Amino acid sequence: ALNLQDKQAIVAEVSEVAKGALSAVVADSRGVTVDKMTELRKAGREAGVYMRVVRNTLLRRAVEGTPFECLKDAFVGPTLIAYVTEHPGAAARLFKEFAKANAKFEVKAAAFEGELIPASQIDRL
Amino acid sequence: YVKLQVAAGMANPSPPVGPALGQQGVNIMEFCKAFNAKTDSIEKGLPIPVVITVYADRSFTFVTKTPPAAVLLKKAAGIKSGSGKPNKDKVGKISRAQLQEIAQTKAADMTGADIEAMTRSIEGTARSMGLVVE
Amino acid sequence: MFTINAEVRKEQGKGASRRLRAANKFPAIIYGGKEAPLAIELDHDKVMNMQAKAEFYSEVLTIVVDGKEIKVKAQDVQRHPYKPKLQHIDFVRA
Amino acid sequence: MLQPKRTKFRKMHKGRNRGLAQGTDVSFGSFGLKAVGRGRLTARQIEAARRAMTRAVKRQGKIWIRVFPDKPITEKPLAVRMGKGKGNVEYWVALIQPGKVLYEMDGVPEELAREAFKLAAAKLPIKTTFVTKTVM
Amino acid sequence: MKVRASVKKLCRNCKIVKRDGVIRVICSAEPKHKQRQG
RNA sequence: AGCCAGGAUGUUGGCUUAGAAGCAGCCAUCAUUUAAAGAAAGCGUAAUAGCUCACUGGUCGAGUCGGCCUGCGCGGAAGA
Ligand SMILES: [Mg+2]
Ligand SMILES: [Mg+2]
Ligand SMILES: [Mg+2]
Ligand SMILES: [Mg+2]
Ligand SMILES: [Mg+2]
Ligand SMILES: [Zn+2]
Known part of the structure; x- marks a missing residue:
């Protein structure tokens, strides 16, 4: 398991790619094999995107590091984060075609401009 | 959905191929000759893995790796x-x-x-x- | 830096010591240097957890007796034959 | 099997087994089997236990046996009256008092050693414990 | 039902349960593993 | 603790064997994507498939894990 020092290092890692990423979408990752998700790590590394599955009370303290503070209620339920550090968008298009093609999970509520974009309206990004 | 490793320009022996891909409802000779015609380009003496994707209608598509x-x-x-x-x-x-x-x-x-x-x-x-x- | 707490012993010998050990303390001694040797008691548990670390043997400790710190080093230890306990300890003033 | 090559005397007084042990400490290996109970070990028993812990380590590391069966023991056969002389020497024993260290070992992990001395202990008549070497 | 003075857990699935002042070993996996002390 | 999800790639690692494909044996036991996934802990196949385990994310919501020293008990304990 993870030491307190580990979790500290990881709040620092996700906070450091947080302050540096333009668009961040939070989704449900559940019901998916490591095959299809290694495929969203290939289409994630190819789209300039940072793909992570991180603890929710760890993402509360990593998101408290601004301006993602409106996502703390999308942290109840399984949580995977796509940070596009290079480009905005290219996460919210890829997660909806991944979620429509696999017919699994959600892609629930995202973050851009310092704001939360709801499930139906991330069609902006 | 079965996976094989089969010699380059070879197919249809009984112990390596026929039983393991043919008890799954798959044509033995269609796979044999389409895989030896696709893998005739693989060097002699190299087993090439072929991933056999079988369907409910028994006609298949294979990805030769x-x-x-x-x-x-x-x-x-x-x-x-x-x-x-x-x-x-x-x-x-x-x-x-x-x-x-x-x-x-x-x-x-x-x-x-x-x-x-x-x-x-x-x-x-x-x-x-x-x-x-x- | 390990800190041991101790009182001077008012009696000596087999009886005093066996009583002391029944009561879950044990006797020790501090000698060396200029002064006269000092007979003290220790709380068994405390020192058994302190000597649980090898540092205890190679380091200068501080024994507080009557509010007075003497700086010592671990010199030697008698242990009970089959039990995990401490029979007695020599400290040399360091 | 252990036994003195040659002795000054052939037979010996019964003796009493009293007091505590000398050599209660681990002078060689990292680990030890200490004797908590009190009694004689026959040579045969020493043999068995050694063979067990040797089995356990898969013939790794190194073992010492810190007790030797020097005292001769005597027995009269069946259907024999009293007196008529001292019995013949059947076997050897070592007299063990609580605190002695019979077996030492090193060149192996802690866990493995705990298990080895356990399986060796099963073949011994005296209640025994596991000790670790201490600095000083 | 092996019946003896020494009873253990002979796999991960074994369970030690004392019924009526008797120590027992109940297994999910293995009928060979059922043990009663006595 | 229990419940939901995953437990992947090179790959069927090499050797060997009619077959060794994590899972007869011998040896290496690396690296990738990773939240996590050992060249795999047990069951399984002719060899595969398959079922779980190690490990992680979700849910839950406050204690919990196993050693030590001891006090008194339990089994061990069948006879005219
Ligand atoms: Mg007296
Ligand atoms: Mg003597
Ligand atoms: Mg849990
Ligand atoms: Mg009884
Ligand atoms: Mg009876
Ligand atoms: Zn069992």
Whole structure:
């Protein structure tokens, strides 16, 4: 398991790619094999995107590091984060075609401009 | 949805192929001759993994993969048999140009980010059969 | 830096010591240097957890007796024959 | 099997086994089997236990046996009256008092040693414990 | 039902349960593993 | 602790064997994507498939894990 020092290092890692990423979408990752998700790590590394599955009370303290503070209620339920550090968008298009093609999970509520974009309206990004 | 490793220009023996892919509802000779006509380009004496994708209507589509890191470092180290005791005994040498060639073949087959990732995984199948990287 | 707490012993010998050990303390001694040797008692548990670390043997400790710190080093230890316990300890003033 | 090559005397007084042990400490290996109970070990028993812990380590590391069966023991056969002389020497024993260290070992992990001395202990008549070497 | 003075857990699935002042070993996996002390 | 999800790639690692494909045996036991996934802990196949385990994310919501020293008990304990 993870030491307190580990979790500290990881709040620092996700906070450091947080302050540096333009668009961040939070989704449900559940019901998916490591095959299809290694495929969203290939289409994630190819789209300039940072793909992570991180603890929710760890993402509360990593998101408290601004301006993602409106996502703390999308942290109840399984949580995977796509940070596009290079480009905005290219996460919210890829997660909806991944979620429509696999017919699994959600892609629930995202973050851009310092704001939360709801499930139906991330069609902006 | 069965996976095989079958010699390059060869198919239809009873113990290796017929039972293992044919008890799943799949044509034996259609697969045999379409796989020996697709893999007639693979070098002689290389088993090539073929992933047989079988459907509820018994007609299939197969993805022929590239010859294994094990078998491609068997042919590129010049060897026949890898080490029966790996990294204890060293049976041949594959230069890093052949690790990047076998990991461009396996770049067609892998999960690697960069040719560094795939050449380090074929580095691992180079140390797993005892073959030195030189 | 390990800190041991101790009182001077008012009696001596087999009886005093066996009583002391029944009561879950044990006797020790501090000698060396210029002064006269000092007979003290210790709380068994405390010192058994302190000597649980090898540092205890190679380091200068501080023994507080009557509010007074003497700086010592571990010199020698008698242990009970089969039990995990401490029979007695020599400290040399360091 | 252990037994003195040659002795000054052939037979010996019964003796009493009293007091505590000398050599209660681990002078060689990292680990030890200490004797908590009190009694004689026959040579045969020493043999068995040694063979067990040797089995356990898969013939790794190194073992010492810190007890030797020097005292001769005597027995009269069946259907024999009293007196008529001292009995013949059947076997050897070592007299063990609580605190002694019979077996030492090193060149092996802690866990493995705990298990080895356990399996060796099963073949011994005296209640025994596991000790670790201490600095000083 | 092996019946003896020494009873253990002979796999991960074994369970030590005392019924009526008797120590027992109940297994999910293995009927050979059922043990009663006595 | 229990419930939901995953437990992948090179790969069927080499050797060997009619077959060894994590899972007869011998040896290496690396690296990738990774939240996590051992060249796999047990069951399984002719060899495969398959069922779980190690490990992780979700849910839950406050204690919990196993050693030590001891006090008194339990089994061990069948006869005219
Ligand atoms: Mg007296
Ligand atoms: Mg003596
Ligand atoms: Mg839990
Ligand atoms: Mg009784
Ligand atoms: Mg009866
Ligand atoms: Zn069982």
